Symmetry: C3
Amino acid sequence: LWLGLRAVLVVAGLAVLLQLIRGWLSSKSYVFNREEIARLAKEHSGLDYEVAFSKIIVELRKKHPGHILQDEDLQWVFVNAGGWMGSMCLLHASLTEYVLLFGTAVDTGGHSGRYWAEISDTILSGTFRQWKEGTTKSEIFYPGDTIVHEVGEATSVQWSSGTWMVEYGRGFIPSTLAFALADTIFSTQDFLTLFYTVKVYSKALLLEASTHLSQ
Amino acid sequence: LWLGLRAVLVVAGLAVLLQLIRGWLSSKSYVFNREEIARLAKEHSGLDYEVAFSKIIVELRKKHPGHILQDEDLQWVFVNAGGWMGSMCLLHASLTEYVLLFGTAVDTGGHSGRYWAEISDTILSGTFRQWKEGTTKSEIFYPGDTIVHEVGEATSVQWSSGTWMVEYGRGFIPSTLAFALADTIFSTQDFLTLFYTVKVYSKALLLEASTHLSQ
Amino acid sequence: LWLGLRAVLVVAGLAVLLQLIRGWLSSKSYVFNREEIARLAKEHSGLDYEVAFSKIIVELRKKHPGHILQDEDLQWVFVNAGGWMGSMCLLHASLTEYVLLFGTAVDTGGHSGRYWAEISDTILSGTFRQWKEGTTKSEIFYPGDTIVHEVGEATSVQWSSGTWMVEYGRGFIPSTLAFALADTIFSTQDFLTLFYTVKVYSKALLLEASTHLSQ
Ligand SMILES: CCCCCCCCO[C@@H]1O[C@H](CO)[C@@H](O)[C@H](O)[C@H]1O
Ligand SMILES: CCCCCCCCO[C@@H]1O[C@H](CO)[C@@H](O)[C@H](O)[C@H]1O
Ligand SMILES: CCCCCCCCO[C@@H]1O[C@H](CO)[C@@H](O)[C@H](O)[C@H]1O
Ligand SMILES: [Au+]
Ligand SMILES: [Au+]
Ligand SMILES: [Au+]
Ligand SMILES: [Au+]
Ligand SMILES: [Au+]
Ligand SMILES: [Au+]
């Protein structure tokens, strides 16, 4: 049973790390809340979505200083995952929370991904078709609506050519990256997009760590 | 010539297993039939696809007792493959045959897959666009039609947001799994859906084995 | 230094090969021209795309004899890449240039791929939606238009059910293959299509090498 040392170690480490991370997540104080982002995004859920982006970033920097990236560190990064393709503008990210502006300028759709995070999306423009698991019918959501993709849930997502939304996620953020880059690794092979994603996540993490040091 | 032992061994094993499986397929008595399933689905291709599903499952359990899964073992499982995403309800499966209810509640499309099985789909609702290999034109099929994906053939499939059909496949069913789970491994990473697929296939195989023991 | 022998060798080989390939591309005469292919395709972008294909192939074989594959070596091969699925008819290909007739008979879309080649597409029929990186809006191109996918650029492409175009690429063609087969390896697993792609590329390379031997 000597070679079972590695297997027992892996099982015990997974159990211990799950216990630690889950207790942390359920006892951790959080910066943002889904209702906050939802109200902020629904206030600006209009036709013009670029002005909505600007106003939302301004409000977030006003009510949460030191937690939103500066304009210098902002860039739209492609996101290929689950068979769909969109783009993201990451405003805030940590090990447990993230806030971004997501959306697509083309018709896409695929698997939503099943990860260890709860994600709220408030549509600013476009249409969002969601197909829940185990059903045979889907629902369409319009600007102003907010869809909550809960932890462990898997749905089919679909977006029209002009869809843009504000997204807030809470959970274990690194695990979500494993999904968010899968198609980038095995389908698109856009290594520059992989670098951009890692770079923006690292910049957000460094901002969050720098704010903690001053406090 | 020890380094060449592995290559000769695998080639010989592949040839022997291919001949054995093909002789089995040419000698095996079959439970279902393509024309039978097509006729059964065509009987109700005028109804709501859920009513059609109910009546088809009832008729299958009547005409083939001991070969269709119990309602307790029935569940809709997502299916991501070839760039498309749908869902399945597996009613019967063996090493050589399978019967299921397939379809999507979103607009999808992709590669049909090229495997060692013949697959018949009878559309109950929606639209089914098929693009055969080597051509520059596609064809759309409507409720009541039956599409035959032959062995070794590869086409492009596309389905609208409300498409549902009855599907019967015959051949070497395990050979298909490599395709039916590929996107689940490298794109969606939905290992829970992979577990569900393995679970329903194992339940169908165990049902088929249990029916053989009583006879 | 022993653990670094492989790493030092790989670094030196990559540097030497990059310099060699760049000096070759800078010191190589080219067979085709981007404006030439664009003009030839736009002159016939008013006909049925099959008649356009025929006339374009005739003109290419007239103005460039010995560089376009014979009709016996021409076949439509499926192309699954970046999440989209179309088909190609390769007319000319070398290590530095390629000319083909691309398009899809289904509605598809995905990642354009980011490789080391500049690619011009002249739409003969259908519609072509392109979404550039860093932007929030896409543009639609119609028959007669020419899209230039530059080196290092990454976009989102989308095509309607009847889209067909003439495509000319120049750069390091092998670098593109890594993209053009990703979905074929990890999603569709249509290894017969992979064989067809390798076969047509090898036929084009052998034709181009045979033309050099006579000269
Ligand atoms: C995200 C793309 C949305 C496209 C909107 C198409 C107009 C409505 O489409 C309908 O939506 C229903 C539920 O979603 C589907 O079940 C129906 O099949 C479909 O006709
Ligand atoms: C390639 C498939 C083209 C389908 C055309 C659908 C009708 C056009 O649709 C419009 O096209 C614009 C251009 O990107 C988008 O910005 C808009 O969001 C979209 O509504
Ligand atoms: C699967 C959903 C299909 C949507 C129906 C679109 C209306 C018909 O669309 C037509 O069908 C033809 C055959 O497929 C295509 O070749 C044409 O390009 C397309 O215009
Ligand atoms: Au941005
Ligand atoms: Au932004
Ligand atoms: Au079911
Ligand atoms: Au069912
Ligand atoms: Au051809
Ligand atoms: Au052709």
